[PDB]
């Protein structure tokens, strides 16, 4: 699954916004336009055993084209976004199966 980060001509968003996966596919973020952008996952809503410190990234990015990879494994669902455009609304969620 490959993410763009920011729309292709005005708006910051997590394109798509949720989706889900088998547990054992790889999630690679990409930026589109709209950088720096950041990843980060609530504390609150993320799975009693699946850290959310490891798949964070509290390391903001300012480098076009640049990208990331996740690749998550239990069943459930996971909380992410972004905190610096999260005045727009720009949020994340993945269903894993
Ligand atoms: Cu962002």
Redesign the pocket.
């Known amino acids: 699954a490959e993410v763009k980060?920011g729309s292709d001509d005005g708006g910051?968003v997590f394109s798509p916004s949720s989706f889900t996966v088998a547990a054992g596919e790889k999630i690679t973020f990409k930026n589109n336009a709209?950088f720096?952008?950041?990843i980060v996952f609530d504390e609150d809503e993320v799975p009693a055993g699946v850290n959310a410190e490891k798949i964070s990234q509290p390391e903001y990015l300012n480098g076009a084209g640049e990208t990331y990879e996740v690749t998550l494994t239990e069943k459930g669902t996971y909380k992410f976004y972004?905190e610096?455009?999260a005045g727009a609304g720009?949020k994340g969620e993945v269903t894993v199966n």
């Open positions: 980060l910051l709209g720096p952008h950041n972004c610096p455009h720009m």
